[PDB]
């Protein structure tokens, strides 16, 4: 079938923001998982992210 | 079938923002997973990302 | 079948924004995964990205 | 079949924005994955990207 | 079959915006992956890219 398991073998680290969305014959609208920007719904190794959200 | 498992073997690091979307004969509209920009839905190794979102 | 697994072997680093979209005979409209620009849906190694989004 | 696995062997770095889209006999319309520009859907090694999006 | 795997061997760097689109007997319309311009869908080594998108 579908292998989506969380199976780290050995090693070490930081694990966060794992999201599993199972839609079984359903209705899903307006989804922004792990969103960092602005979402409007009307019905030496360095990674650096900086986001400024201003809603007026 | 489909192999999408999380299987790091040895090593070390930072693991974040893993998103699994399974749509089984369903209706999905307006999806911006891991979005950093602006989403409007009307129904030495360095990576640097800077985003300014102004909604007036 | 389809091999899309996450299998780092040894080594080290930063791993983020991995998105798996499985559409099984479904309806998907208006998808901007890992979007950094502006999405409107009406129903020494250095990588630097700077985005300004102004919605009036 | 199809080999699309994530298999770094040794080494080090930054890995982000990996997107796997599997469309199984489905309907997908209006897709802008990893988009940085403007998407309107009506139903010393240096890489530098600067994008200004103004929606009036 | 088709070899499209991500297999860096040794070395180091920055890896981002890898997109795998598998269309299995499906309908895909209006796709602008990794788009930086303007997409309208109606249903010393230096690389520098600057894009201004004005929608009136």
UniProtKB/Swiss-Prot annotation, chains A, B, C, D, E:
Transmembrane segments: none annotated. It is found in: Cytoplasm. Residues 31-43 have a biased composition (Polar residues). Belongs to the TRAFAC class translation factor GTPase superfamily. Classic translation factor GTPase family. ERF3 subfamily. [PSI+] is the prion form of SUP35. [PSI+] is the result of a conformational change of the cellular SUP35 protein that becomes self-propagating and infectious. This conformational change generates a form of SUP35 that assembles into amyloid fibrils. [PSI+]-aggregates sequester soluble SUP35, resulting in defects in faithful translation termination by read-through of translation termination codons. [PSI+] can be cured by GdnHCl and by deletion of the molecular chaperone HSP104, which is required for [PSI+] propagation. Present with 78900 molecules/cell in log phase SD medium. Heterodimer of two subunits, one of which binds GTP. Interacts with polyadenylate-binding protein PAB1, and TPA1. GTPase component of the eRF1-eRF3-GTP ternary complex, a ternary complex that mediates translation termination in response to the termination codons UAA, UAG and UGA. SUP35/eRF3 mediates SUP45/eRF1 delivery to stop codons: The eRF1-eRF3-GTP complex binds to a stop codon in the ribosomal A-site. GTP hydrolysis by SUP35/eRF3 induces a conformational change that leads to its dissociation, permitting SUP45/eRF1 to accommodate fully in the A-site. Recruited by polyadenylate-binding protein PAB1 to poly(A)-tails of mRNAs. The prion domain (PrD) is a Gln/Asn (Q/N)-rich domain, which is unstructured in its native, soluble form, and which forms a parallel in-register beta-sheet in its amyloid form. This is Eukaryotic peptide chain release factor GTP-binding subunit. It comes from Saccharomyces cerevisiae (strain ATCC 204508 / S288c) (Baker's yeast). The gene is SUP35.
């Amino acid at each position: 079938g579908y292998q989506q398991q969380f199976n780290p073998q050995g090693g070490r680290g930081n694990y966060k923001n794992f999201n599993y969305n199972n839609n079984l014959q359903g209705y899903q609208a307006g989804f922004q998982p792990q969103s960092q920007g602005m979402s409007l719904n009307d019905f030496d190794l360095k990674i650096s992210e900086s986001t400024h959200n201003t809603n007026n």
